[PDB]
Amino acid sequence: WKEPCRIELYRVVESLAKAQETSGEEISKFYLPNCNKNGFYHSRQCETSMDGEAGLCWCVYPWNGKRIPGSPEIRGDPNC
């Protein structure tokens, strides 16, 4: 797609909404694609947190949102 992150974000949000309907426990962290305004992926991708815990972050190729091999994953800005 020309805006792969934007498209994925919409789909993930829809899927999350559906999952929450039947979810056996309230999920307070989840991954929403972190998109730039052009519809691609920010180099940094972070888990969304709603529980006062830092989300995991990792680094991705902006054109596909796939984790860069050998790049770090930490609960903080990995400095991608």
CB of 44 to Fe ion, least distance (A): 7
Query: Which C-beta is closer to Fe ion: that of 2 or that of 21?
Result: 2
Q: Which of 8, 42, 47, 58 binds Fe ion (CB under 5 A)?
A: 42
The three state secondary structure string of the chain is CCCHHHHHHHHHHHHHHHHHHHCCCCCCEECCCCECCCCCECCEEECEECCCCCCCEEEECCCCCCECCCCCCECCCCCC
Residue 45 sits in the site that holds Fe ion (CB under 5 A): no
Residue 43 sits in the site that holds Fe ion (CB under 5 A): yes
Q: Which residues bind Fe ion (CB under 5 A)?
A: 42-43
